[PDB]
Design an enzyme around this catalytic site. Structure first.
Site, PDB file in Angstrom:
ATOM      1  N   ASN A  93      46.241  37.591  51.617  1.00  0.00           N
ATOM      2  CA  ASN A  93      46.311  37.221  50.217  1.00  0.00           C
ATOM      3  C   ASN A  93      46.707  35.753  50.095  1.00  0.00           C
ATOM      4  O   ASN A  93      47.274  35.185  51.033  1.00  0.00           O
ATOM      5  CB  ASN A  93      47.393  38.065  49.553  1.00  0.00           C
ATOM      6  CG  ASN A  93      47.432  37.888  48.060  1.00  0.00           C
ATOM      7  OD1 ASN A  93      46.403  37.964  47.390  1.00  0.00           O
ATOM      8  ND2 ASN A  93      48.623  37.696  47.522  1.00  0.00           N
TER       9      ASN A  93
ATOM     10  N   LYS B 192      42.807  52.854  35.508  1.00  0.00           N
ATOM     11  CA  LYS B 192      43.007  53.736  36.652  1.00  0.00           C
ATOM     12  C   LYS B 192      44.449  54.200  36.824  1.00  0.00           C
ATOM     13  O   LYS B 192      44.683  55.354  37.178  1.00  0.00           O
ATOM     14  CB  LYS B 192      42.463  53.109  37.942  1.00  0.00           C
ATOM     15  CG  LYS B 192      40.959  52.855  37.884  1.00  0.00           C
ATOM     16  CD  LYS B 192      40.397  52.294  39.177  1.00  0.00           C
ATOM     17  CE  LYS B 192      38.889  52.074  39.053  1.00  0.00           C
ATOM     18  NZ  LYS B 192      38.275  51.509  40.301  1.00  0.00           N
TER      19      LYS B 192
ATOM     20  N   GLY C 285      42.479  40.089  49.940  1.00  0.00           N
ATOM     21  CA  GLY C 285      42.992  40.517  48.651  1.00  0.00           C
ATOM     22  C   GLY C 285      44.031  41.591  48.867  1.00  0.00           C
ATOM     23  O   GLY C 285      43.980  42.296  49.865  1.00  0.00           O
TER      24      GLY C 285
ATOM     25  N   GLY D 172      45.410  43.544  45.879  1.00  0.00           N
ATOM     26  CA  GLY D 172      45.609  44.102  44.548  1.00  0.00           C
ATOM     27  C   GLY D 172      45.109  45.525  44.591  1.00  0.00           C
ATOM     28  O   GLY D 172      44.910  46.073  45.672  1.00  0.00           O
TER      29      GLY D 172
ATOM     30  N   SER E 182      28.071  49.796  31.633  1.00  0.00           N
ATOM     31  CA  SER E 182      28.362  50.426  32.891  1.00  0.00           C
ATOM     32  C   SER E 182      27.028  50.908  33.397  1.00  0.00           C
ATOM     33  O   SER E 182      26.136  51.181  32.602  1.00  0.00           O
ATOM     34  CB  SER E 182      29.276  51.629  32.679  1.00  0.00           C
ATOM     35  OG  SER E 182      29.491  52.322  33.889  1.00  0.00           O
TER      36      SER E 182
ATOM     37  N   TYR F 232      22.241  36.635  47.181  1.00  0.00           N
ATOM     38  CA  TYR F 232      23.479  36.858  47.925  1.00  0.00           C
ATOM     39  C   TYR F 232      24.657  36.380  47.094  1.00  0.00           C
ATOM     40  O   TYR F 232      24.515  35.437  46.327  1.00  0.00           O
ATOM     41  CB  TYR F 232      23.472  36.089  49.247  1.00  0.00           C
ATOM     42  CG  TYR F 232      22.437  36.542  50.238  1.00  0.00           C
ATOM     43  CD1 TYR F 232      22.732  37.542  51.164  1.00  0.00           C
ATOM     44  CD2 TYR F 232      21.170  35.973  50.259  1.00  0.00           C
ATOM     45  CE1 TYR F 232      21.788  37.967  52.084  1.00  0.00           C
ATOM     46  CE2 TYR F 232      20.214  36.389  51.174  1.00  0.00           C
ATOM     47  CZ  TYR F 232      20.527  37.385  52.085  1.00  0.00           C
ATOM     48  OH  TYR F 232      19.581  37.796  52.996  1.00  0.00           O
TER      49      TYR F 232
END
Ligand SMILES: O=C(O)C1=C[C@@H](O)[C@@H](O)[C@H](O)C1
Ligand SMILES: O=C(O)C1=C[C@@H](O)[C@@H](O)[C@H](O)C1
EC number: 1.1.1.25
Lengths: 271, 272
Positions: free
Chosen positions: B150, B65, B126, B128, B14, B219
């Site tokens: 989506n 989460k 997306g 999610g 991380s 990129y």
């Protein structure tokens, strides 16, 4: 900004981030040191990754010291003997140097505590990894002799013969110890549980200095035992922790940082 | 010396410890931020142990989460709406506050890049958790509209109906997007795997600002794709990462740390 870290599992109780943060500030180095927890079977990958992203070096705590020894491209003479590696460093050619600073950290703490290792008779209690890692650095201080002991003579006999070429290193069993030593070094953990080795206390004397790798609030049980029998000075291992860190810092930055203020500060927290 | 940390498994190196450690230096805050492993039995166990031993706060990475959402004693409005918590804080009374800073991190990064969100037409690719976590903060900027999309329609429509009240939100399937958008946000992971969404590049125009949540050297594929169709500005998610970090840091320390120098150093590491 250079990246450094300590890899182990768990890491929540590690004092290295705190220690190194201060070393960087004291020597004004542009570096960051963080504690990174790693899966039990993912050290090699976590490591190779760390260096891939631009990791300069790192410390390895339990339980990865052995895997670190194999992960290293080249090993220093002291890591060689130790059989473990607690410090890694990426060289210019891409190679990763494996070293072990635990023993040298002990040596520097002794010197910092004003203990004369030159021409001293040393008794090293224990023959596990801890004991193995501190033999070479002690021998480099040129003591008169080092006596190794273990509850099981055999393992103490292996270790004494491993470094017999480097100097006067005798191996004896608990039952054979019948004289005093200048410096008594305890590398066993039994004491944290109130247990003392069955050794005649004649090993301690008024001229003796006792060093215990364990540490805590006040005095360690081993040291108290040492003072019941007239030990002159008793030191715990908190300084060994900072010392090993100082030596690793040395290896990575090329400067040995001061350990005195940091030690004193960690001492406060424990108390 | 307060203890803070980030929980993952991995935790595949991380950058939060690096980030927050620097925020600490800049704000001269007496604290240490570490990367903790989450045990197999659960994050809940880790969290208890962490806050039990004196921890004051911590970040949570995916896929923990939702479990952090349950662990919290109180949730901020944005956390309830996001349905996930990336930031926990032990409050003075002992309660554990659960917040979600991902969305606001995105918003601040966009605003830092001179992107106008008020009255803008936005396309969120997306539907999610990543997508859901940015809806509320984006809606707060009062855009003209947000079209969630989506691969499979239903999912996007369901996410749109979830926040329909908080603003002009509509849904469309990949194959239906036939107009350009002022701001396009990619919340999928396709850019890491090397794929692009099955969306006609007509969504991009000379005026479009494209934002990819993924990041890396050069990129991202999604941004290269945007540049092929002449977008006016392509941005990767490195800023979102530092931005969500800054929000959490403030929440915990009561001070906001700067992000540009930190963001510049990370970029240097990424570029090899
Ligand atoms: O707690 C720590 O960070 C450490 C503990 C010992 O294993 C040391 O040998 C290691 O270098 C670092
Ligand atoms: O990689 C990380 O350290 C993080 C990633 C994101 O999930 C963030 O939401 C989290 O707070 C920190």
């Amino acid at each position: 900004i250079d990246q450094y870290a300590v890899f182990g599992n768990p890491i929540n109780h590690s004092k290295s981030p705190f220690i190194h943060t201060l070393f960087a500030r004291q020597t004004q180095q542009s570096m960051i040191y963080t504690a990174q927890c790693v899966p039990v079977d993912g050290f090699t990958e976590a490591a190779k990754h760390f260096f891939a992203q631009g990791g300069r070096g790192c410390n390895v705590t339990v339980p990865f010291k052995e895997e670190a020894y194999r992960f290293a491209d080249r090993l220093t003479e002291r890591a060689r003997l130790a059989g473990a590696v607690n410090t890694l460093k990426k060289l210019d050619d891409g190679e990763i140097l494996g070293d072990n600073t635990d023993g040298e950290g002990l040596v520097q703490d002794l010197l910092a505590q004003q203990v004369l290792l030159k021409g001293a008779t040393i008794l090293l209690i224990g023959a596990g990894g801890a004991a193995r890692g501190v033999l070479k650095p002690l021998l480099d201080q040129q003591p008169a002799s080092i006596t190794v002991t273990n509850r099981t003579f055999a393992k103490a006999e292996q270790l004494a013969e491993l470094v017999a070429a480097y100097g006067e290193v005798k191996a004896q069993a608990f039952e054979q110890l019948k004289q005093s030593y200048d410096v008594i070094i305890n590398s066993t953990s039994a004491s944290l549980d109130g247990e003392l080795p069955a050794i005649d206390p004649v090993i301690f004397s008024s001229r003796s200095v006792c060093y215990d790798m364990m540490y805590g609030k006040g005095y360690t049980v081993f040291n108290q035992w040492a003072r019941q029998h007239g030990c002159a000075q008793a030191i715990d291992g908190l300084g060994m922790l900072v010392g090993q860190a100082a030596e690793s810092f040395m290896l990575w930055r090329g400067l040995r940082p001061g350990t005195k203020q940091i030690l004193r500060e960690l001492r406060k927290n424990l108390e």
